[PDB]
Each structure stands twice: as structure tokens, then as C-alpha cells.
């Protein structure tokens, strides 16, 4: 699985993988771990993105909050404001089940791009990667951030602000 | 990371530096310049870019410059630059025995008490105004060489200007002026710091602006 | 495991060996990362054996200087958040030579001529001539430096929690 | 090797991540199995001996001669410095003598680990093949779910108020 | 890469493969409407259909109406409703009427299929019910 799932290996560390998580695994749970590790940088590349556009001032719809963790999780209101949301998340990852069982299918392709692209046009796969450093990044930048207003007061920027 | 990398076309990996015996030597530098032990713990000889582009833009014509010829270049100019100015540094200030300073009021102890304030005080007046133009024409007619060098045309050697008024080297064996061409890296290296020093100290909190500045 | 030395017998106190001490399996899965974890567990052992005297010395002797003194500190753990203008410093000179370090990590391994750990630092002459004293030479480094890896943090976490003098008791 | 047993159904399918069973022969795993069971075990009766109090449900009178009650004792890891050092002997010195002596395989003729059985069959053999399987695997599951049950009862107990993570919201 | 490319390897028909129509989310998304969805009968497929129609019809009446500022403003538009699906009731009876042509022999072995006069029959009856009884699911549902 590592030599023809070449996507996530780059220059810093060609094939990063320290304490052998991946050795000697089958393709079901390799095909797993990929699907994981590509949903937590989606969800914390948008997480990012979300969590400066509300700290930095413009939070439109009912003008309520500036920092973003009490504008969610003490303040917005539990019973339909959040049961709604985790629903409307439930039916896309329901679609993608149907997604997922299908023929010639890739570890995380909701958008069924490998209809027109077979991975080996190397554009295909060097903009991939630029997804998925990115992910990476973005996955410890949230958790940089949520424990920087977690224990602290400060939820901004503390390197350059 | 499946490409060749970029550390073997400037690394070397058969011989190693006289200057820390742990690294490989850069494949640029050689014995063959004065003033040599092979340190280059960054690897800065190895970079691959033509550093002439400041001067004249690489757009102009197809042209390079080796990237060792600049830095010599460069290190021969900072030599220069600190050995007058730690020298000018310290005698205007007394440290020599005699105050040395320029005739006039306007130079003189009571306008400025110590190099320290010379930089700002002729800054005003215009005398450091004036030699920022002196040196511009100079450095204008003196740069326009790296570009000859760069286009093959020339076989002039770094820091190489005719500049032998007394004639200390006409005819002596290349090991002469080899030796001789050292003093001129040893000593501007000891001055580069010497000034650097001078420099950092007379400007913390205390540090005197005496002939010691400690 | 081969030819890399460094297990060799000394009863562990649970009942086993330490001659081929890989429990978790580090050198079957991922051996391209073994100069980089020889590396490693020198440095970490380096730097080890010299805070363990590191904190043998600052009892009895304390360099002449008004900002460290026993009136002015006493106790020699609270050196670390009471001399931060040393504190920097050291920082900074060992960032010179950590620095100077990288291109010799950025081929370690296959491509670069050395074996991990080895500077070519041996000014007085030491290090022996043949292999039966030389790959003992390397053993007698790698034990000091491991149980000196452990020493400091008994030391240290002792100080904590006693708050007495040199052996703690 | 090991990638067919009970333990083994999906989601999940075979789940081995940190890689005990790479090196393992039978040996090994049967230490592994005999006791993930006696985990689960004790969490699921973990779970008996815990909502009943927390509902209220205590044993009639006092505990003792002495005159300590059931209802005085609060649920929780705060309850055990309210039951007597010498009732805590009691029970401490049983579910030692328990694993001594009668929760233990002393025939040799145990078919799986986990069977304590002893020879004295109590309708085993009524079951079909499939349906010994199924059973077995019932117990696994709700033993694997009760320890991370009571590892959740003990953590949020001290953290918060209530142990009852899941009925904290929409109302206690 | 390209990511557009004649539909069904046909360059001369006129349709284009898109990631709007053919990718991965509008193939399972389509196929799993009732329109289309493999395994209905024909009643069925009308049913559902009719069930999640009936149920939004409801709202531009009950809000913006004639009557909507007045203490029987939920039974003023939910009437209104039943109306507006009588009149498309009306266009699917009389669609299937001539769109389609009966069948002369008995013959019928695939008695599943939609586009036909029988089935449209139970199609439209199947819209009927599930678009008057979504009507009146939210008529309770918005009585609260
Ligand atoms: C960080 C320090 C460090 C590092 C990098 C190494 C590195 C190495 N050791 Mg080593 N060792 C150390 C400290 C270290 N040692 C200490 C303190 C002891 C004394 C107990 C030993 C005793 C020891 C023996 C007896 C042997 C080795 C061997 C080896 C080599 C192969 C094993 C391997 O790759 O695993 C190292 C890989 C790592 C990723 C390092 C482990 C770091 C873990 C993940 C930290 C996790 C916490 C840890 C359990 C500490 C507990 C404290 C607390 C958190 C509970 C390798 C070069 C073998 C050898 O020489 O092979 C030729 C061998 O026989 N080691
Ligand atoms: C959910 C998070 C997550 C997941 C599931 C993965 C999973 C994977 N990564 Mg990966 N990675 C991650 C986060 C993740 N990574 C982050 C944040 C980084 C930046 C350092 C990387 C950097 C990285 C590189 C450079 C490479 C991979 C590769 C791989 C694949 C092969 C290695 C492997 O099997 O690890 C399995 C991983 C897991 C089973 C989850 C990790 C378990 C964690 C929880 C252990 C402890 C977490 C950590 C120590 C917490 C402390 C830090 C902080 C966040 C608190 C595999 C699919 C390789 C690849 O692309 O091959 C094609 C590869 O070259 N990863
Ligand atoms: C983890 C992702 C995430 C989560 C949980 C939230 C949660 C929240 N945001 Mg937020 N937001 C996000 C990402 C997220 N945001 C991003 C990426 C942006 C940049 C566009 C914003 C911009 C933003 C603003 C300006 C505000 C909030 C606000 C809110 C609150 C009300 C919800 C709302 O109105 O969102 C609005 C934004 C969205 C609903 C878009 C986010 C979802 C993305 C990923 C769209 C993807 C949908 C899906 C992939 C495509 C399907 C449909 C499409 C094909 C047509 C709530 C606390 C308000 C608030 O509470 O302020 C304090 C508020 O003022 N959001
Ligand atoms: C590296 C990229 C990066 C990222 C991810 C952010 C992210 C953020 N910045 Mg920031 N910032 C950056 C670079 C970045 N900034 C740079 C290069 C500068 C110039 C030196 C600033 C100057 C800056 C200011 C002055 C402020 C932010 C603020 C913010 C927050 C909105 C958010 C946390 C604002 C903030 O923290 O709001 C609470 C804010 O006031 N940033
Ligand atoms: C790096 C060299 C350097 C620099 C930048 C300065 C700069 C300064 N000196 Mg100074 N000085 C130096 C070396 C230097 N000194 C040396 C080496 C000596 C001793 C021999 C002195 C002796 C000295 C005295 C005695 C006094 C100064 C003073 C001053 C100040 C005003 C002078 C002025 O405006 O220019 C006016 C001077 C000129 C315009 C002279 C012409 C300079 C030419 C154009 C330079 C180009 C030739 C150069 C040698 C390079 C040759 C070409 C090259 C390719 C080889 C100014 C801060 C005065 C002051 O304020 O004291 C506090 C003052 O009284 N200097
Ligand atoms: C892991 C097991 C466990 C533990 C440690 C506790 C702990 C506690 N319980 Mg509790 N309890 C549990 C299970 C547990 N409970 C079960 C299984 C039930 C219902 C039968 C209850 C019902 C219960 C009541 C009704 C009361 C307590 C009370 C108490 C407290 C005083 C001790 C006492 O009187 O025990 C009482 C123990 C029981 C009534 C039953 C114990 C059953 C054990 C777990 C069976 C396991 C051994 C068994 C012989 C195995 C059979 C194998 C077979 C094949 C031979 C204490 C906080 C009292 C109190 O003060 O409330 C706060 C009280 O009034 N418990
Ligand atoms: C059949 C034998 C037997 C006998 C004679 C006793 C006798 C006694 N038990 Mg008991 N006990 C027994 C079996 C027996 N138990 C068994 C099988 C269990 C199950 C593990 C217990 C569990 C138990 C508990 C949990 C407690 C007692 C306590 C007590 C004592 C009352 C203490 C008091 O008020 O002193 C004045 C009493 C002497 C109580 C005690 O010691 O409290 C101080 C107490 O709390 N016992
Ligand atoms: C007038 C007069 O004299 O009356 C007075 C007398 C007196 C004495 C004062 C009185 C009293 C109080 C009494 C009698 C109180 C009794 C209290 C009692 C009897 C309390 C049992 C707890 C049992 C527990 C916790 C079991 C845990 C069981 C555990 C933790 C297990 O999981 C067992 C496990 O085994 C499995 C299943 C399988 C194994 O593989 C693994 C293990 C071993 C771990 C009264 C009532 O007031 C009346
Ligand atoms: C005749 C005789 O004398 O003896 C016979 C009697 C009898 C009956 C035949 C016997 C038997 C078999 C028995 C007793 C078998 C028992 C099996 C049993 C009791 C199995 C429990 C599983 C519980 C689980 C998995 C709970 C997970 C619970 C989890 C993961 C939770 O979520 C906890 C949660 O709490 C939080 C953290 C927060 C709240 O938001 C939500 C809730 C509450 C949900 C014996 C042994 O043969 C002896
Ligand atoms: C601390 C200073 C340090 C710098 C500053 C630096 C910078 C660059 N590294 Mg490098 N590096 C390390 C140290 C440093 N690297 C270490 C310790 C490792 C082992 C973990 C390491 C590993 C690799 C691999 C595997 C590759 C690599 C490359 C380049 C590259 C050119 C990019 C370009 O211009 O295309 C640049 C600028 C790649 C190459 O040569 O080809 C693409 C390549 O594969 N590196
Ligand atoms: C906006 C949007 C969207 C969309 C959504 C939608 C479009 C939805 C819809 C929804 C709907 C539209 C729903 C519906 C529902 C319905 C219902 C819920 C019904 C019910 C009914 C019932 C239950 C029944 C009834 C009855 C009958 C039939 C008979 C008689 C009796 C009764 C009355 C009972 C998306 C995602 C794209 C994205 C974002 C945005």
C-alpha cells in the first residue's frame, strides 16, 4: 500500500512513519487510515479558516460574540442550533457510504475525481500533496489554537499580534 | 521525496573540510585561494545562484558569475572597509595618543566629544552627506568589473585592482604573493570583528566612549 | 542490531536480559531510522553526564561572582530562573554549534562516510587502536551516558521532593 | 494468524493498531484473551453494583452492629471512605479468596480461556456451534463496552458533579 | 488533466461530462431518488415523491397569504394546499391519459415499470396521498 499510495510523501521526510504504525497492515485498515487522516485536515483546514474570520471581527448574522469559543459551546443554544448542524453533517457522511461502496474507488475521493485523472499526471499529484500538507499543518494549528484560549485569554495571535 | 537531492551536487562526499574534520569539504572551495582551512559550515560557497543579478538583472544577457568569486569579492570589501574604519574609529577618539580630527571648529572636541556622536552629528551638517557621494562614484566605477568577469571576458582575480603604488609585489614568486594576500584576509578578518565589537558595546546602557569601551 | 553495538550482559531486575534489549521492535520496523536513533541516545546521553556533575560541583565550590553566590542563591536547582542573563547566553553559543551540526544530520545514514555520534574530537588521544578495545571504548560511552540519562532525572525530581543536599537522603 | 477469532466482527474488522500480536504465539494471546474477558468482567458487574445505588435501590437497615447505614454512603469513589475500614477487609479478603481458589481452572480441561467451568457441564453442549459462538462474543462486547463504561463513571465522577456524562445534558 | 470529456465516449452527441453531471456525488445522489431508485413500485415511487412536496407546499400560504394575519390563518392556507395539489393532480391524470397507450395483450411481465399507462395510474394516485397527507402532517406540526 505505501508504493502505490505515493500521495503524502514529500521532502522533508520521505515517508514519515516513526513507531510503525503502518508496518505490516492489510489494505482495509491502511485504506482507513488514509480516509481518516484526510477528513481531520479537511475538518481543521475549515476549522482554521472559521476560527480567524470570527476572531478577527466579522461575525455577521445576530452580531452575539468576538471570542469563538464561548460564541459556540457556552452561548449558541444546545437544542437545535447544534442538533441541526451534526444532522446535516450525518446525511453527507450517509451519501458517502454510498460513495464509498462503489467500484475503482480511492481511500478519500467524495468528488469521484479519479473519473478523469488516473494519478500519474503529476500536476494531479503535486496539488494533492499541496492538500494535504496543508491539512497537516492546519491540524496542528487548531490544536495550537485550542489550547492557547482553552487555558489562556487570548484566542489571536500571539506570533506576530 | 523521491527526487535527487540537492545536497550531493554540493557536498563532496569523498574528502572533508580542514575546518571542522566532521563536515564534508564544499566542492567549491579548494586550497588555491589565501587565507583557506576549508570553513563553510553553511555552505554558502555551494549556493547555485549568480549573486552578479544585484548589479546587472540576469534578464540583460546569458551571464554568470561563480558563486566563490563573488563572496571573495565581498569578504575583501568588508576586509578593507573595517581595517580603515576601526582604525578611523579609534583615531579620532585619542586612543592613539593624539585626538586626531580634521582642522577646523566644526570638527573639533567641543562639537563632537567622541566618535560615538559623529555619525549623527556630521549627518546633519552635511559632511557625511557629502561622502556617501564620494563613495557612490567610486563604488559605480569599481563595480561594473564583476559584470566583465561574469561574461568570461576577464581574468581578473577577486579584489584585483592595480592598486600597487609602492610596488611591494612587482616580481615576487607566487608563494610571496600568496603570503602577502593572507595578511590582507587575517588581518581584515581580525578587523571585521574588532569593528563589530567596538560597534555592539558603545551602545548598551553603560560602556564608556573611551579608548576602552568596556 | 548487528555491527551497531551496545547489548551486552546486564541483568535487568524484572527477569530479563539486556543482550538484545528491543522490546517494542524499533530495529524490524523502520531500520532507516536507526543512525538517526543512535544519533539521538548520544546526544541525549552527552548531555546527560555532564549536567549530572553539572550538579555535583555547584555545592561546595561557586566561581567568584556577587550573582551567583550561596547568600545570594542557596539552593542550586533555583540557578535555572535566577541567572537568565547566562541562561541565553549558553542558549545562544550552543545554537553555534548545534547549527554547524545540520549538514552532517541532513545525510545521516548511507550517504555520508560517518557513524553516528562520532566527531572527530579527540584532541588528547584516547580513543584506542584496535577493535577488541575500540567497540569496548564505544560500550563503556553508551552505559555512563544511560545511566546517566536516568541519574539526573532521579536527581532532579529527588530535589524537588526532598529538598535536601547532594546524595538526598 | 489471529485475524479469525471471536473478537474479530466488523466495524473494525481485525483491530490490532499498536502490533501486540506480530510476535505472539499461542501462548501469548491466551494470556491476552483470559484476561480482557476478566476486565470485562468485572466492568460489567461494575455496572450492576453502580446504577442501583445511583437510583436509589439501598439494602434495608443499618450496615453493621454498630450502626452505620446503606443510604448514608454516597455513589462513587466518594463512598469509600464512608464504609468501615473493617467492612472494607470483608470485601477485599472475599474477592482475594474468590481468585485464589474458585475462579480458576484446576482440572485442566478448560475448552477457551475464561472458562471456569471445571468439568461440570450445565447445558453447554445444548448449544449449537453458531449459537456457543455468538454468546461468547455478546459477553466480549459488552465486556469491552463496560470498561470504557466505568473508565468513563470514575473519570467524569471526579472531573464533575454527577458521573452520568450523557444524562447530564438535556436535564439531570 | 482535463475535466471534461464527451459523455458516454461519444464526442458527436451532444452532451458534455461535467463534474455537475457525472461525478460521484450527483451519480449516488440521483440514483438514490425516487424517481429513479431501483426496487419501487410504482405507487411507491409516487408516494414519496407526493410525501416530501406536500410538506414545503404548506409554507408560502401559511406565511405571505391573504389570510395569514388572522386567528384561522393555518386552516386558510392548508386548504390552499389541497388546492394547488388537486391542480397538479389534474396534470398528471390528464398527462398519462396521452402521453401513453393501452396494452392489447394481456401480456405483462414487467408490471414494475413506470412509463407506462397502468403504472402512471398508480404513480399519480400514489402522489395524492402522500401530498395530502404531508399537507396535514405540519398542519399538526405547526399547530404547536
Ligand atoms: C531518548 C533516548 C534514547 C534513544 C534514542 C535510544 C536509542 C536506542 N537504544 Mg536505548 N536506552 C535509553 C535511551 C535511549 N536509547 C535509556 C535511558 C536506557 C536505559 C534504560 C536504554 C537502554 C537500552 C538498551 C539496554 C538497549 C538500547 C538500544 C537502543 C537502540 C535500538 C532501540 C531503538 O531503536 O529504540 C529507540 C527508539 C526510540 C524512539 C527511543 C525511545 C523513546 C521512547 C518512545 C520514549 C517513551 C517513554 C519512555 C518509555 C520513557 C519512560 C518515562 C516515562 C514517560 C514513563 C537505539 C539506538 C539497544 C541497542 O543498543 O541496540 C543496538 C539495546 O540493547 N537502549
Ligand atoms: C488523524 C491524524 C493523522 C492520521 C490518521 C495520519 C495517518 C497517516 N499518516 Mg500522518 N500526519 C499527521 C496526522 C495523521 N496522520 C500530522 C498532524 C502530521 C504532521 C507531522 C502527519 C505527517 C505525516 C507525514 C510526513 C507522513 C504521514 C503518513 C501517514 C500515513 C502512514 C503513516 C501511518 O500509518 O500513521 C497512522 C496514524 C495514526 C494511526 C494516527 C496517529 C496516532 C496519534 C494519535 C499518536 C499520537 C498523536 C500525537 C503524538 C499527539 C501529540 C501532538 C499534538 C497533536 C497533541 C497514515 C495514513 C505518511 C504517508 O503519507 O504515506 C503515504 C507520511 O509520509 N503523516
Ligand atoms: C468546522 C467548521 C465550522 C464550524 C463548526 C462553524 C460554526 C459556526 N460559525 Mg462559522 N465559518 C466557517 C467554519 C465553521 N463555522 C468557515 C470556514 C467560514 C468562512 C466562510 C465561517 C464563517 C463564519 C462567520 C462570519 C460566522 C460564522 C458563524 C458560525 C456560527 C453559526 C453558523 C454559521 O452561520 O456559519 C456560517 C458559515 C458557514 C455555514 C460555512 C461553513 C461551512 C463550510 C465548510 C461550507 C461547506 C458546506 C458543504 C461542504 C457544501 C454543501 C453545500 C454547498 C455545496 C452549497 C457557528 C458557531 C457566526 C458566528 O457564530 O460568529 C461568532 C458568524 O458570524 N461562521
Ligand atoms: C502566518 C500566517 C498568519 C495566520 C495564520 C494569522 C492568523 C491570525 N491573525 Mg495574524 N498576522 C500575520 C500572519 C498570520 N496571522 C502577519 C504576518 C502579521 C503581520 C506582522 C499579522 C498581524 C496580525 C494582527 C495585527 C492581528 C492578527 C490577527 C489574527 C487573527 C485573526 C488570526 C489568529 C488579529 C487578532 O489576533 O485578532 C484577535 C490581529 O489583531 N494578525
Ligand atoms: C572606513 C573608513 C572611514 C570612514 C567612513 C570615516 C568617516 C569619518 N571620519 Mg574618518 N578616518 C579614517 C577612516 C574613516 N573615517 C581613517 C582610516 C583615518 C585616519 C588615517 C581617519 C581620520 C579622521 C579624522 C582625523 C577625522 C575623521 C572624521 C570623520 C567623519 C567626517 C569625515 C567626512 O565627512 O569626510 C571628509 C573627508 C573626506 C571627504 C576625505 C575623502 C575620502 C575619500 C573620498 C574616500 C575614498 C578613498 C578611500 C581611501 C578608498 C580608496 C579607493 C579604494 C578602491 C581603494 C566621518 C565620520 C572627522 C571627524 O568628525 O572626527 C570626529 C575628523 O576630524 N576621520
Ligand atoms: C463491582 C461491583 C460493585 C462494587 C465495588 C460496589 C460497591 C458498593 N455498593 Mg454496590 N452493587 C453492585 C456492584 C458493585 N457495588 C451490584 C452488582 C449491585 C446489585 C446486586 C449493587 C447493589 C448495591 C446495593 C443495593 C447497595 C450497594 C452498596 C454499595 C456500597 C457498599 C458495599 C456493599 O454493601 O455492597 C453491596 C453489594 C451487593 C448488593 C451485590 C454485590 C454483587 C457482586 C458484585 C457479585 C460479584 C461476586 C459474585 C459472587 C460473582 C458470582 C459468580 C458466580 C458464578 C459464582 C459500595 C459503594 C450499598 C450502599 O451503601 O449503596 C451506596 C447498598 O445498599 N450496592
Ligand atoms: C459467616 C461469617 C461471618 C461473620 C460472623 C461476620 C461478622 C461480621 N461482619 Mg461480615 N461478612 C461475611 C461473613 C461474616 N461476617 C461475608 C461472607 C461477607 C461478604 C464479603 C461479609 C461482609 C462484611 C462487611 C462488608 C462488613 C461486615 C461486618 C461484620 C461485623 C460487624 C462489625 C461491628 O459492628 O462491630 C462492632 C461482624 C463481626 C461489618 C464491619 O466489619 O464493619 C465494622 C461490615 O461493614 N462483614
Ligand atoms: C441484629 C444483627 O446482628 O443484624 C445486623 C448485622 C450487621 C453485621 C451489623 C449487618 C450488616 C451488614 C452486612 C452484613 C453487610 C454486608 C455487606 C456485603 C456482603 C457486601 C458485599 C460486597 C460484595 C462485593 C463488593 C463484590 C464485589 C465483586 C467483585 C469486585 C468482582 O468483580 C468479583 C469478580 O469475581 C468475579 C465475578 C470474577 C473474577 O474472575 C474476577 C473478580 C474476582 C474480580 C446488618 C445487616 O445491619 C444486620
Ligand atoms: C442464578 C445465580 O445465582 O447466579 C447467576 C445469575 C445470572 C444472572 C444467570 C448470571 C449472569 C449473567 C449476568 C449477570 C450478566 C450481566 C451482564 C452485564 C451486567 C452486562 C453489562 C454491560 C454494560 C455495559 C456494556 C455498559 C456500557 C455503558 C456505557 C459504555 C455507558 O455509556 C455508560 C454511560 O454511563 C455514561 C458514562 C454516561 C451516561 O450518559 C450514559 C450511560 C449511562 C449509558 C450469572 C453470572 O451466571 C450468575
Ligand atoms: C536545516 C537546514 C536544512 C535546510 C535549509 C534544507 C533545505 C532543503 N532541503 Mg533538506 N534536509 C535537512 C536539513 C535541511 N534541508 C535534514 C536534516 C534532512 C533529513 C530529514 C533534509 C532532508 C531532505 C530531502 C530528503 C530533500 C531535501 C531537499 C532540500 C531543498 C531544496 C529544495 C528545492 O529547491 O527544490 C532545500 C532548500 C530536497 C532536494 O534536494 O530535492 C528536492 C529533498 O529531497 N532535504
Ligand atoms: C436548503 C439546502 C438544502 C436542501 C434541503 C432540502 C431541499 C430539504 C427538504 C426537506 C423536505 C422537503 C422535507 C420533507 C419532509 C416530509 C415529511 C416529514 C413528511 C411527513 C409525512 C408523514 C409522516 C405522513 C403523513 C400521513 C400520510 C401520508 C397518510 C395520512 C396520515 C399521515 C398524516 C400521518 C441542501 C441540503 C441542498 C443544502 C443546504 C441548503
Same mark, same amino acid.
Given at each position: 500500500?505505501?508504493? !502505490?499510495?505515493? #500521495? ?28 481518516? !487522516? ?36 457556552? $452561548? ?10 451534526? @444532522? ?10 454510498? #460513495? $464509498? ?28 500533496? $499541496? !492538500?494535504?500538507?496543508?491539512?497537516? @499543518? ?11 484560549? @482553552? ?11 | ?113 567622541? *566618535? ?17 557621494? *564620494? ?80 | ?13 524484572? +527477569? ?13 520496523? +523502520? ?5 538517526? =536513533? ?30 551567583? +553566590? ?24 550552543? +545554537? ?15 550517504? =555520508? ?13 584516547? =580513543? ?39 546524595? =538526598?537522603? | ?109 478448560? &475448552? ?17 456451534? &453458531? ?7 455478546? &459477553? ?33 | ?6 459523455? /458516454? ?22 440514483? /438514490? ?112
Amino acid at each position: 500500500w505505501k508504493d !502505490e499510495n505515493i #500521495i503524502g510523501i514529500t521532502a522533508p521526510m520521505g515517508f514519515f512513519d516513526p513507531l510503525g504504525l503502518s508496518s505490516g497492515k492489510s489494505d482495509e485498515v491502511m485504506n482507513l487510515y488514509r480516509e481518516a !487522516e484526510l477528513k481531520h485536515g479537511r475538518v481543521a483546514m475549515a476549522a482554521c479558516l472559521g476560527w480567524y474570520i470570527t476572531a478577527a471581527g466579522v461575525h455577521p448574522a445576530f452580531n452575539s460574540a468576538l471570542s469563538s469559543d464561548p460564541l459556540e459551546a457556552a $452561548k449558541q443554544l444546545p437544542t437545535v442550533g447544534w442538533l441541526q448542524f451534526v @444532522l446535516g453533517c450525518g446525511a453527507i457522511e450517509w451519501l458517502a457510504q454510498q #460513495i $464509498k461502496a462503489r467500484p475503482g474507488y480511492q481511500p478519500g475521493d467524495i468528488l469521484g475525481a479519479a473519473y478523469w485523472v488516473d494519478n500519474s499526471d503529476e500536476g494531479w499529484v503535486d496539488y494533492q500533496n $499541496k !492538500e494535504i500538507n496543508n491539512g497537516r @499543518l492546519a491540524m496542528v494549528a487548531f490544536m495550537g489554537i485550542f489550547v492557547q484560549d @482553552l487555558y489562556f485569554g487570548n484566542y489571536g495571535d500571539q506570533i506576530f499580534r | 521525496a523521491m527526487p535527487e537531492r540537492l545536497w550531493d551536487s554540493m557536498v563532496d562526499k569523498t574528502q572533508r573540510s580542514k575546518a571542522v574534520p566532521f563536515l564534508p569539504r564544499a566542492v567549491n572551495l579548494d586550497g588555491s585561494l589565501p587565507g583557506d582551512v576549508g570553513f563553510d559550515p553553511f555552505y554558502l560557497s555551494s549556493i547555485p545562484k549568480d549573486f552578479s543579478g544585484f548589479i546587472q538583472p540576469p534578464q540583460w544577457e546569458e551571464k554568470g558569475i561563480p558563486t566563490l568569486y563573488w563572496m571573495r569579492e565581498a569578504e575583501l570589501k568588508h576586509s578593507r572597509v573595517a581595517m580603515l574604519a576601526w582604525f578611523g574609529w579609534l583615531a579620532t577618539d585619542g586612543a592613539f595618543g593624539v585626538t586626531l580630527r580634521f582642522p577646523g571648529e566644526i570638527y573639533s572636541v567641543e562639537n563632537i566629544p567622541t *566618535a560615538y556622536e559623529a555619525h549623527n552629528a556630521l549627518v546633519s551638517q552635511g559632511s557625511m552627506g557629502f561622502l556617501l557621494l *564620494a563613495v557612490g562614484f567610486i563604488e559605480f566605477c569599481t563595480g561594473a568589473v564583476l559584470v566583465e568577469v561574469a561574461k568570461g571576458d576577464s581574468d581578473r582575480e577577486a579584489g584585483d585592482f592595480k592598486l600597487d603604488p609602492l610596488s611591494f609585489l612587482k616580481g615576487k614568486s607566487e608563494e610571496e604573493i600568496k603570503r602577502m594576500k593572507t595578511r590582507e584576509i587575517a588581518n581584515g578578518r581580525l578587523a571585521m570583528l574588532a569593528f563589530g565589537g567596538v560597534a555592539t558595546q558603545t551602545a548598551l546602557e553603560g560602556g564608556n566612549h573611551a579608548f576602552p569601551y568596556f | 542490531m548487528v555491527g551497531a553495538e551496545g547489548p551486552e550482559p546486564i541483568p535487568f531486575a524484572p +527477569s530479563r536480559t539486556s543482550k538484545n534489549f528491543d522490546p517494542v521492535g524499533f530495529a524490524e520496523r +523502520s531500520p532507516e531510522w536507526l543512525p538517526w =536513533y543512535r544519533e539521538a541516545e548520544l546526544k541525549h546521553g552527552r548531555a546527560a553526564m555532564l549536567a549530572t556533575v553539572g550538579f555535583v560541583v555547584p555545592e561546595f565550590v561557586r566561581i567568584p561572582g556577587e550573582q551567583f +553566590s550561596f547568600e545570594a542563591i542557596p539552593k542550586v536547582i533555583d540557578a535555572h530562573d535566577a541567572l537568565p542573563e547566562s541562561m541565553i547566553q549558553i542558549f545562544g553559543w550552543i +545554537s553555534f554549534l548545534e547549527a554547524c551540526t545540520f549538514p552532517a544530520m541532513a545525510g545521516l545514514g548511507g550517504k =555520508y562516510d560517518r557513524k553516528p555520534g562520532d566527531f572527530s574530537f579527540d584532541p588528547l588521544g584516547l =580513543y584506542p587502536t584496535d577493535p577488541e578495545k575500540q567497540k569496548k571504548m564505544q560500550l563503556a560511552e553508551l552505559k555512563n551516558g544511560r545511566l546517566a540519562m536516568i541519574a539526573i532525572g532521579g536527581m532532579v525530581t529527588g530535589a524537588a521532593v526532598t529538598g535536601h543536599g547532594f546524595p =538526598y537522603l | 494468524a489471529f485475524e479469525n477469532e471471536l473478537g474479530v466482527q466488523p466495524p473494525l474488522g481485525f483491530w490490532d493498531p499498536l502490533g501486540l500480536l506480530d510476535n505472539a504465539d499461542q501462548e501469548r494471546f491466551d494470556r491476552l484473551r483470559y484476561v480482557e474477558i476478566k476486565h470485562g468482567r468485572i466492568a460489567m458487574l461494575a455496572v450492576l453494583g453502580h446504577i442501583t445505588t445511583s437510583s436509589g435501590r439501598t439494602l434495608g437497615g443499618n450496615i453493621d452492629f454498630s450502626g452505620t447505614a446503606f443510604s448514608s454512603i454516597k455513589t462513587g469513589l466518594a463512598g469509600l471512605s464512608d464504609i468501615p475500614q473493617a467492612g472494607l477487609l470483608q470485601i477485599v479478603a472475599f474477592i482475594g479468596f474468590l481468585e485464589l481458589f474458585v475462579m480458576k481452572d484446576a482440572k485442566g480441561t478448560g &475448552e477457551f480461556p475464561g472458562d471456569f467451568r471445571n468439568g461440570i457441564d450445565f447445558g453447554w453442549n445444548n448449544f449449537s456451534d &453458531e449459537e456457543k459462538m455468538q454468546k461468547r462474543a455478546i &459477553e466480549l462486547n459488552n465486556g469491552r463496552a463496560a470498561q470504557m463504561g466505568i473508565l468513563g463513571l470514575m473519570v467524569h465522577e471526579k472531573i464533575g458533579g454527577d458521573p452520568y456524562i450523557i444524562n447530564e445534558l438535556l436535564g439531570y | 488533466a482535463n475535466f471534461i470529456k464527451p459523455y /458516454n465516449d461519444d464526442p458527436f452527441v451532444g452532451h458534455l461530462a461535467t463534474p455537475i453531471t457525472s461525478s460521484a456525488v450527483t451519480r449516488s445522489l440521483l440514483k /438514490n431518488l425516487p424517481a429513479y431508485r431501483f426496487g419501487l413500485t410504482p405507487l411507491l415511487r409516487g408516494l414519496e415523491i407526493g410525501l416530501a412536496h406536500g410538506y414545503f407546499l404548506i409554507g408560502p400560504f401559511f406565511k405571505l397569504g391573504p389570510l395569514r394575519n388572522s386567528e384561522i390563518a393555518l386552516f386558510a392556507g392548508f386548504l390552499s394546499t389541497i388546492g394547488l395539489i388537486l391542480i397538479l393532480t389534474l396534470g398528471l391524470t390528464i398527462y398519462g391519459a396521452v402521453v401513453f397507450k393501452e396494452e392489447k395483450v394481456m401480456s405483462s411481465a414487467n408490471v414494475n415499470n413506470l412509463q407506462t399507462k397502468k403504472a402512471w395510474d398508480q404513480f399519480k394516485g400514489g402522489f395524492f396521498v402522500g401530498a395530502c397527507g404531508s399537507a396535514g402532517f405540519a398542519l399538526i406540526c405547526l399547530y404547536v
